[PDB]
Amino acid sequence: QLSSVPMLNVCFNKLFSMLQVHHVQLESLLQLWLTLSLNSSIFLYNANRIPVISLNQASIASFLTVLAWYPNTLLRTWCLVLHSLTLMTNMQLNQETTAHLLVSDPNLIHVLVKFLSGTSPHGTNQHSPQVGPTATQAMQEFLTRLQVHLSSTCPQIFSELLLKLIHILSTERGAFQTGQGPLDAQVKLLEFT
Amino acid sequence: LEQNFEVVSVSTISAVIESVTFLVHHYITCSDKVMSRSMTRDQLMFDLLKLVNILVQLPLSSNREYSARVPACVADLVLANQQIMSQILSALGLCNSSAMAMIAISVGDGLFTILTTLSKKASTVHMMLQPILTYMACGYMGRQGSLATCQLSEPLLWFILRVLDTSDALKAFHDMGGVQLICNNMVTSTRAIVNTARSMVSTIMKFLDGIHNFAPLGTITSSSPTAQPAEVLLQATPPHRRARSAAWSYIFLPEEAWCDLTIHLPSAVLLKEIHIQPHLASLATCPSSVTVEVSADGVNMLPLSTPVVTSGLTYIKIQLVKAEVASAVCLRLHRPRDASTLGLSQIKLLGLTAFGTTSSADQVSKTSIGWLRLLHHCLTHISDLEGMMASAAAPTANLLQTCAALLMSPYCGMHSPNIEVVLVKIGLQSTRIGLKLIDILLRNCAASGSDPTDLNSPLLFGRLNGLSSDSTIDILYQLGTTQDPGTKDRIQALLKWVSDSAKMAALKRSGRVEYGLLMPSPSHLHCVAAILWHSYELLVEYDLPALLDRELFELLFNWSMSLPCNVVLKKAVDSLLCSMCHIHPNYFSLLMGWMGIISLTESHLATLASSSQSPEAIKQLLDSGLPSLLVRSLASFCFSHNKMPITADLVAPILRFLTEVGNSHIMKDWLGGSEVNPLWTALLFLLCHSVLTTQQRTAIENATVAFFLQCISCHPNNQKLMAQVLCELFQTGNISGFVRRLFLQLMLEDEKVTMFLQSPCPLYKGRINATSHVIQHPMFGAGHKFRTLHLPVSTTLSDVLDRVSDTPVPVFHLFHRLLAGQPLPAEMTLAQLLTLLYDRKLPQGYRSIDLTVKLGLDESLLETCPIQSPLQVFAGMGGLALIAERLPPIPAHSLAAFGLFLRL
Amino acid sequence: AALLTAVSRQLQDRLTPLEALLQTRYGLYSSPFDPVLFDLEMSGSSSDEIDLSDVLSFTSLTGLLEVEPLHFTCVSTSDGTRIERDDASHFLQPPPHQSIIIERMHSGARRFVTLDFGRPILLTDVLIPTCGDLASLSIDIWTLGEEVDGRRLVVATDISTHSLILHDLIPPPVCRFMKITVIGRY
């Protein structure tokens, strides 16, 4: 009879709180949250889908900080990040919308730089510097959902965030000058700007 | 690496060591999920580790600001820095055994060499021990208060063994408290880890039904409408070489850069390797880069890694470091770099399913066994520090339950006998620990806390109570036979367990912790009986007749009478009764008082024989005249077809009773006595050589052949008497069926002798990886030290020593009590040895040959003639000519002639 | 029901632990220790258990104990098909399976094999397995003369989907030679 949605909110907010102290792994928690929010919604991922599991402001801030210093974030950890961040742009917080929380957070620009300058830092095997089509599409839907959610409220902050992204990539010791990072994701970001 | 660093500043060396250590730890901890194989950055990291190895060997100057111009070393400052040592120990922890097994081309060998050089160049031993203790205490990221332990890999385990090799390192390890921390980390990791053994679920699924391709079961789809269906790519048959035509060809539009191939497996399987075969005739059509998308749900593709460059490869093999479930696999293939067409020969998805015949074809890190490997090394490396390590491991809660669960788990990296040694020394440290270990093995095997609500306390639920294996038999036997103070309390606990099991069986019969008393192991009861027999034989200091109780003997008698005769548990209780009759001669007289002998059934006769296997009970049974009464009444029943009536159903239990009591040598001499001599010819007259029904006749036939074979077994005057009886039978037309039964099985089958081996070194070849209940006599004992083999007399001693142990240089040498201090040759057989022993003090027809195996006139023993077979004595008496007369691709004329010359 | 219950109780009483060990470990359910055997049945021949998933979603030869298995030798000439073996003490041993192999089969025609027992017997049981390749089958038996005392045992147009089964021959014929004519499907 009682809805189990608020208990799931409490325990997932707890897990996102213990993300900072290395108590829980990031990529498995993101996969679990995405799987539950996708099935409860039927199975297929859609950008026009509100998650059933609601995360607080401190959970998103801890997630962005953990991403802001996560060493050698793998590429499909990054795709889990992009799909999850799209779903938190769909997510309502109980004020300020969560897309405004994402763009207003200073860690998101470092997240985007670390994605666009990731390349293959381990270099264990010979790999292409491009990220493939799926990561490019996921980044495109994430930026599109940011644009849609902040067109009415404040598009100037999103435009300034995009310009700061291009500025940080385009300076000296950057991804644009050194040639590192995906070409496809940077080209799609340029087309979106 | 070629340069030498002499007067370089210390701060530069420390910065280099810290930065390279962090870089190598970042390289090892962060690796791609997809590995693909067709100078290297592994060589770069290994040369960096070689540079750190050179830098830690540098001597240090007195001012310590700069290195020595040319005691103090740079390795001391490496040991002082906690971050560098934590990163090195963690980086060796994430390394598997596959990288280290090259022992030095990989980075794990570089970390091992750096750590070994740090151990060698340490100023004091405690300076090397302190980061190790910090890494054990910290866990994963310094976390405490939860079910978190640091991951111990096999290379890291080997490094800690090489650190704790020296005696001062072990003493400093106890001074730091590392033994308690190892035990607590063992308990918490055993609580945290669930076993991945295949268990009994996979057995039922295997009956109800190294990596296999699942591409033919799947269906391949492409989102491009112009693409071919590509179903030939999923075929299991590989395309032939130089086919000159692509199996599937895709035409690329100029705007299109990626082509997708999507394979939907019918069920989700574990996926390990993906093999893509390009067109061999033209590698221009080979894809430039391939990325792999997998999906556990099958509709939402979460891919694996970055796109792998596949240009100029005849075969694309994509291998996952981590096997992941995938019900659907999608493959995005890039446009070729030069050609505009995509040529694929075959696509293979290699993996394993769960729950089937396809579910078939590092353990230190997965399980909690490496902590007990360290505990075993600390206990058994040096005997002087052994007691003080065992006193260190004593106050740890739930250690014995964890060690027993690791003992009877499947093999997870370390063999069961060393687990047994750890359990023996922990139980032998104190009397309370010994009684606790006896309680765990027999009555209650569960955690002392036993709190499922707490969810962080250890719990040992899931292990069956009172469960037996050969390991626990060895634990109980070594606890019983050890003559340390507190032994009497352990024997009292064993006898209390036996008494409580008998009372629980009585209450089960009445129909009114508890599971161990409800189900006793027959092997455990036989082990208790063997402990009692060998402690009575050893003349122990504690009074073993005082520990035995008359009411316990009565309870065991009623429990043995209640069980059916075919039950193994009745044989175990009868072995306990035999041990108590051996220790107490009055117990056997009280037993015959219960029998009423001054109405016998089959369980009565079985209990009488098994309790009368002991020689004092042999003497008392011979003095009571019970086998005399049975032999006269049996001869009367034979003549029919003080006297006692014998029913026809009772006859074969009487013969079985006579066989089992005639296992002994005194009653072997008694069956050659003048009273029993009419019985053999009377049995031959009873069976009539073709009244009794057919099934009764067949059963009494088998029992008569077994009885005569037990009578004549390596007893030369008995087989001489049997030859006299048989030649008198043959002298008095054609060969009957039971006569041929007797001749073949009694006469032409070679005689087999029971043989008992005693070795101080434990023998492990005969033991297997299952539980079994083989009830034997309590003089033979139990455990890996004692072996019993039932072998023919033609078998050599070399085959015996090969059967008891592999022994692939110290050599095991066979020894005998009569042959004191004289080695036995491997070339002789058991028959020549029996001839020698019958020449010496050992009586004819002994129960078992006693051989002593100790690790390191023989030709005169080889010249000794073997024991004559019953065939040899029978043909020496001349009955072979008699059976030649009575008898009615080898040629048949050879056989007919051979019979005619057997007449001669 | 009452006879079923009583004979079931006695059948439980007949069981020995060694035969039960054979049943639970090797899947062998016939009793090897008991010398007496009541009946033998042969319906389809070349651990035994039934597939409980497939069945739970025939006619058998009965008797087979006073009669004797008989070795046969194809010393008589056969046209169109040769006899190859699949890879009274001698008669008490079972005969080997000798499946006939045609080097070329061609539809809607006639072929036959011919066999000899070597001595006159009384033949009572015929078991021919069903063969979906074949349309019709017939067998001709004779003794003394080839056609003087020749008699046809059976005509079988049912050989495609039914086995040719003769449970007993009530006038038991005296036979030494047989031929079996096989006709393939159209």
Place this chain on the structure above:
Amino acid sequence: DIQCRYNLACHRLEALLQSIDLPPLNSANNAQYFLRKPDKAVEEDSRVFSAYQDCIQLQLQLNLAHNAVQRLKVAIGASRKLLNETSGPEDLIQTSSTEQLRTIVRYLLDTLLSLLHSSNGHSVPAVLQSTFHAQACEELFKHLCISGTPKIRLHTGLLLVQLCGGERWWRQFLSNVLQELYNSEQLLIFPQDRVFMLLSCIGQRSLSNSGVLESLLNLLDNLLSPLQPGVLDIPMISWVVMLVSRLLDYVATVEGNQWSFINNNPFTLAHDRCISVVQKLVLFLLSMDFTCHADLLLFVCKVLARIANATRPTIHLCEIVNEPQLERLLLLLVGTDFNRGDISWGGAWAQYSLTCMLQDILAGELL
């Protein structure tokens, strides 16, 4: 002569049978012994196969020779064995051969299966209720299924389906039969697995009534009752959980699949009876350690999800688990305590089963 050779074969087979040990599948070590099939056991089983083949061939030759001897005795003029009305029927059953008893019971089972297939209403007036009660059905099921051949066992099982499907005690019969046969306290040496496949089939034939699975769940929550605050045993609880899973899968077939990886290739139960079963299953899921296996965790997840979707009010995730217990369950899913780096808690299969478990519960609640 054939009797002499047969008796020689029987003696060597009896000695070879005394050479054999057999583990009772009480632990995972005996299970691994059955899974490995070691080469010493292989050569022992090959020797048993050779000796048994010699015994059965020589027994068949002896019986053929004996009936030929009896036929020639008839040919002389001696009559066969004449039957006596003075002899009682009980000694007539007693003196008869074992294979004669098997053939008689087989023909009686075929005849009774023909009676239950009657043209007049598909019913039997007396044996449906009066002749077959619970005690007689249990005893006859035991005597023909532990001791009998698979054919006669299958026929008497389907016969007992026909007679006692309509009785209300069929569910208690099946739960009791499974409990006494598969108990670790039981010492009956019988093929457990073929009887288990028979038990799955005999559950499937009466599966349209929900009472059989209800009684199985009542048995299952009776077994997990030590775990809620007793002695708990893995094997027979695993037997019960497999029977429940196979019956629920057969329900899914008669009515792709999220639980297809566990497969090799009016039913709706009440909530208040099921909730204790599912809560004890959650406690068993959280209470696994190195003594337990993830191999039972797959079935606990599958059974728990199928029961949670099976009830007419779908079991919410609130009452199935406590909030610290749910936090613990996600710690088993995500968290460096239980899966560390490359190492996964119970492998990838256990984590996938836990994910599909939570997926099925949330899909049942939200629908």
